[PDB]
Ligand binder design. Structure first.
Ligand SMILES: Nc1nc2c(ncn2[C@@H]2O[C@H](COP(=O)(O)OP(=O)(O)CP(=O)(O)O)[C@@H](O)[C@H]2O)c(=O)[nH]1
Ligand SMILES: [Mg+2]
Ligand code: NA
Ligand code: NA
Ligand code: NA
Length: 414
């Protein structure tokens, strides 16, 4: 039998709207990531989606068909159990331009990524570009490019686009990134993609001695309506562990924490609590390591965690020393052009007093530029940000025609 373990690696799925990210994740895992009513209704990803699968290989069979996502080799005529390789999980990002920030949040949780490119749409589309560049900036460079929807175009058309993709990646960090043609919808050539995932998105080394840090993207509670009020389960906080590991009964804190109102004046106070449970998907564990999306059960009042209230927070051990900053200095670099815009547009230099959007970890925060230099800006934040390390990368966005567009990036200076 295959072991029941947590996913050991996170693979982002990104790309332009409707190019088939969620359907690809379904093709691989059997799971439709969209759980929210508005997502199902509007037919779009809004919040980050999530799905896990085991990966195995039938050692006596021919590749890529030998790769399986369930413990059976019957499809290659063997009654032998396939060799378990690892459990993996997917971070399914929204493609809509208006949701770029969400993609950015998800990118902080990715060990590698799949860029989905629709074979029946002109390449390169705005968010194909924006997601690609964002991946490059953030350092998610273990990339597979998937040409999806090949089922509706001839092989020749798909090859023409393939040539375009090679042209696009040439001279960039992605020059030798593999391109794999599939049909996510009708499940064609998925095995080649599994093989490619095993080859190009290896589980990274984890230094489990590092201080535990989790980036928070969800928060909620299991309590069904009409639940007896003093028998409510504690709040649950969901996210991904980016370093170290957490264990049941650990004393933890959520940073920056809780918004506090004092005569209409606002501060943030760390939220202290204790880990009552650890879960990945449908399985309970006693500890939680990088890879996968974890649900940390706590003793918190469910009202504190309701409706993703804590999105963008981080969680550390209670005694961790972590700067929570209302002002930050950023060593920055700007892109030459607003890659995510439909019509070509140059990036204007940063101006003092302008409002910028900053993506840091899973958080998204508006701030006012208080100082501009050639290599550095200083920003007064509308809300504080937890900065858990010295070389944290931030992505900078500017509001352009009412739309937040990525325009640069930088290092948060301590
Ligand atoms: N013909 C064909 N259609 C596909 C394929 N993959 C996805 N689609 C279709 O494209 C549409 C959008 O698919 P979906 O998987 O939701 O794309 P998405 O990129 O996650 C959309 P969003 O960016 O909002 O998250 C759906 O109608 C879906 O059935 C494919 O391989 N072939
Ligand atoms: Mg989707
Ligand atoms: Na990463
Ligand atoms: Na085809
Ligand atoms: Na190029």
């Amino acid at each position: 039998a295959w072991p029941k373990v947590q996913p050991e690696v996170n693979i982002g799925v990104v790309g332009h709207v409707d190019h088939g990210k969620t359907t690809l994740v379904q093709a691989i895992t059997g799971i439709w990531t969209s759980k929210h009513s508005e997502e199902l209704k509007r037919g779009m990803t809004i919040k980050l989606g999530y799905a896990e699968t085991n990966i195995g290989v039938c050692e006596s069979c021919k590749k890529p068909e030998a790769y399986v996502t369930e413990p059976s080799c019957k499809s290659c005529g063997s009654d032998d159990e396939p060799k378990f390789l690892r459990r993996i999980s997917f971070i399914d990002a929204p493609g809509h331009e208006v949701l770029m920030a969400t993609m950015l949040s998800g990118a902080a949780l990715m060990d590698g990524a799949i860029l989905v490119v629709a074979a029946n749409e002109p390449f390169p589309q705005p968010q194909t570009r924006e997601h690609f560049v964002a991946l490059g900036i953030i350092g998610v460079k273990n990339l597979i490019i998937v040409q999806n929807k090949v089922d509706v175009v001839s092989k020749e058309e798909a090859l023409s686009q393939y040539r375009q993709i090679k042209q696009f990646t040439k001279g960039t960090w992605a020059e030798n990134v593999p391109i794999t043609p599939v049909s996510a919808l009708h499940k064609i050539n998925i095995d080649s993609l599994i093989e490619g995932i095993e080859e190009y998105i290896k589980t990274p080394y984890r230094d489990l001695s590092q201080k535990p840090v989790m980036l928070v993207i969800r928060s909620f509670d299991v309590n069904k309506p009409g639940t007896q009020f003093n028998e409510l389960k504690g709040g649950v906080i969901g996210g991904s562990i980016i370093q170290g590991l957490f264990k049941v009964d650990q004393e933890i804190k959520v940073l920056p924490g809780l918004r506090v109102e004092k005569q209409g004046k606002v501060s943030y106070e760390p939220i202290f609590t204790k880990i009552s449970s650890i879960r990945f998907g449908d399985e309970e564990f006693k500890e939680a390591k990088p890879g996968g999306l974890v649900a940390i059960g706590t003793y918190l009042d469910p009202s504190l965690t309701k409706a993703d209230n804590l999105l963008g927070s981080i969680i550390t051990l209670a005694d961790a020393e972590v700067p929570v900053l209302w002002n930050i200095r950023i060593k920055y670099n700007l892109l030459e052009r607003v890659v995510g815009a439909k019509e070509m547009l140059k990036v204007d230099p940063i101006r003092a007093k302008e409002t910028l959007m900053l993506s840091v970890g899973s958080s998204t925060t508006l701030g006012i530029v208080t100082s501009v230099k050639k290599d550095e800006i200083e920003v007064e934040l509308r809300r504080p940000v937890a900065v858990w390390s010295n070389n944290i990368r931030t992505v900078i966005s500017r509001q352009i025609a009412g739309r937040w567009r990525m325009i640069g990036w930088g290092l948060v200076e301590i």
